[PDB]
Design a protein around this nucleic acid. Structure first.
Lengths: 283, 306
DNA sequence: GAGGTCGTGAGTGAT
DNA sequence: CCATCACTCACGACCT
């Protein structure tokens, strides 16, 4: 009865100890397969031996001297260099001319590395965010946190929240960046509000050349009134998907036949026609 | 009758782990308030990170340009906690700043368990594992949402990070390292005050750098007029849910937005309803291409169970 | 004879 | 002021 709950709660205790034991053994076996002086011998030495060689590795690593430790300034800075999606750019505190630059700028915004070096920083920086920048690394201090825009790459702006401490003059600072078809958009009349970049391969056109115009111009005379009338139906068809087929024009001046399917998307509350989305397929 | 010898081995283990404890280069302070299993897991984490780091040289992080105290300043100036671990689940390092964002000290957290699946609520485990299941996109980013067991809900935390190369090693073989910055999301952001027409009342000024559009230029403009024509349907069903009910209803969204200068900048938006008629407040966060891919995977997965 | 494991009491607290 | 709870810690007996 209650004595049967005794050894059943004692069963819970025995299983707690079971988990404890296998967990210690797991920490132990992982430590074994981790430290090289124990990660090789397949006849894993006895638990005491691996504890001893672990004492060895720990202290030999912790030989530094003259949170105290548990990460080096080198270690943390290295990781933030290859983690923060940012970059390092040492500059000057007397003039501003770039001192050191990292290759970590190289893939983040696809910027060249040593182009900053050889130039000053105000060259390719908005002069409007130079004003107090100049008067931030100035002398007569405080922990730096001045928000600053930054140039992107130019071969094949963004704000970096650079926090740190000024130095010898020069300025050292870092921080994570503070940051075949084509589908288009029309209005209730038929003017391009948006068009995908795939037009260069379906009509031989960059998107801006059709943006700001109505499609009906580029429709063949025999198909113009058709296409107009069609869209007039599709509008009041309450977004029921619908298709039209018209000869789209081209700067190649080749009359190419094609099909376009369209329907209306309505903000469910307003129920007002917010935009027209037109799928297009060049054949 | 192993009373004599088994005692000797037990106490030998205790002595070597005592050596481990006082040699554990943590603070003199918190260590006396520790447990043995705790000390063991902690020492394993240190040895792992140590052999990882020592197997490389200080190449592209030149030293001396910064001081260690100034390094502590830098990490004190971060909006979250740093985390580096293996895809097998094995932790490497956690900056103590997590306290100012999670309460429970790092030493009080890595104690009971030595894995990511020990500092993470059950629900998201598989999902986490899912975004961890793919060991590809090398030196490319990944972004996922998950919770961390709080100091008793557990606050949702965004995690963005990069994988790196495992150095020559039989253990690290089939186990690259993943470093990541993490931050509690519910308060590099633009806040949106939206009404029931998904229009634009007030935006955070910072959108001026995110989109090149000054706040006044967006006053009374349908935000639908900035949506990519493809994830439109996702946003539409989410507006449907945010409208059909009455209460503190929450919403998530992965979207793409255009720009003044042209181009595309993916955004991750979250919404919570203040009142049944009151304004709908929303927090947005910018991401990268794959930093929307992984979110799309996690999102669709969260919808598969339904 | 070594190495390791499944088991319990006595003392110890946070809930 | 105990009262059930986990969690940590030793210990003689017990596989192989």
């Amino acid at each position: 009865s209650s004595a049967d709950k005794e050894r059943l709660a004692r069963e819970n205790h025995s299983e707690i100890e079971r988990r404890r034991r296998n967990k210690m053994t797991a920490y132990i076996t992982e430590l074994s397969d981790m430290v090289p002086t124990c990660s090789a011998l397949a006849r894993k030495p006895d638990k005491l031996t691996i504890l001893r060689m672990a004492v060895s590795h720990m202290k030999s690593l912790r030989g530094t001297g003259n949170k105290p430790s548990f990460l080096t300034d080198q270690e943390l800075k290295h990781l933030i260099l290859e983690a923060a999606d940012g970059f390092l750019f040492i500059v000057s505190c007397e003039t501003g001319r770039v001192v050191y630059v990292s290759d970590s700028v190289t893939p983040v915004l696809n910027q060249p590395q040593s182009e900053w070096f050889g130039s000053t920083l105000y060259d390719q920086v908005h002069p409007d965010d130079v004003d107090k920048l100049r008067e931030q690394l100035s002398t007569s201090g405080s922990r730096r946190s001045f928000i600053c825009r930054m140039r992107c790459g130019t071969s094949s702006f963004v704000v970096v929240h650079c926090t740190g401490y000024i130095k010898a003059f020069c300025l050292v600072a870092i921080g994570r960046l503070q940051v075949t078809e084509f589908i288009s958009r029309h209005n209730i009349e038929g003017i391009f509000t948006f068009v995908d970049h795939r037009c260069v391969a379906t009509v031989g056109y960059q998107p801006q050349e059709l943006l700001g115009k109505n499609i009906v111009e580029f429709c063949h005379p025999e198909d113009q009134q058709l296409l107009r009338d069609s869209f007039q139906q599709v509008v009041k068809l309450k977004g029921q998907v619908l298709s039209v087929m018209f000869r789209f024009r081209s700067k190649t001046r080749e009359w190419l036949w094609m099909r376009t399917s369209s329907f209306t998307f309505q903000n469910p509350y307003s129920d007002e026609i917010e935009y027209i989305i037109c799928t297009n397929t060049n054949v | 009758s192993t009373k004599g010898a088994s005692k000797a081995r037990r106490d030998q283990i205790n002595a070597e782990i005592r050596n481990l404890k006082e040699l554990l280069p943590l603070a003199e302070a918190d260590k006396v308030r520790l447990s043995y299993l705790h000390i063991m897991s902690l020492a394993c984490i240190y040895t792992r990170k140590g052999v990882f780091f020592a197997g490389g040289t200080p190449l592209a992080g030149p030293t001396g340009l910064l001081s260690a105290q100034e390094l502590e300043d830098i990490v004190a100036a971060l909006p979250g906690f740093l985390l580096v671990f293996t895809a097998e689940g094995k932790l490497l390092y956690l900056s103590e700043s997590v306290s100012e964002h999670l309460g429970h000290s790092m030493v009080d957290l890595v104690a009971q368990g030595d894995s990511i699946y020990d500092i993470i609520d059950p629900a998201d485990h598989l999902t986490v594992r899912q975004q961890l299941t793919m060991p590809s996109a090398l030196d490319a980013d990944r972004l996922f949402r998950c919770r961390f067991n709080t100091s008793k809900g557990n606050k949702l935390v965004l995690i963005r990070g990069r994988f790196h190369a495992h150095p020559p090693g039989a253990y690290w073989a089939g186990n690259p390292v993943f470093t990541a910055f993490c931050a509690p999301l519910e308060p590099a952001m633009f806040q949106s005050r939206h009404a029931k027409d998904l229009a634009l009342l007030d935006v955070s000024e910072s959108v001026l750098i995110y989109l090149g559009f000054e706040r006044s230029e967006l006053l009374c403009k349908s935000w639908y007029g900035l949506l990519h024509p493809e994830d439109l349907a996702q946003a539409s069903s989410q507006h449907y849910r945010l409208l059909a009910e009455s209460g503190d209803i929450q919403a998530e969204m992965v979207v793409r937005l255009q720009a003044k200068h042209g181009g595309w900048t993916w955004i991750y938006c979250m919404l919570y309803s203040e009142g049944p008629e009151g304004p709908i407040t929303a927090n947005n966060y910018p991401i990268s291409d794959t930093e929307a891919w992984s979110l799309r995977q996690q999102l669709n997965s969260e919808d598969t169970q339904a």
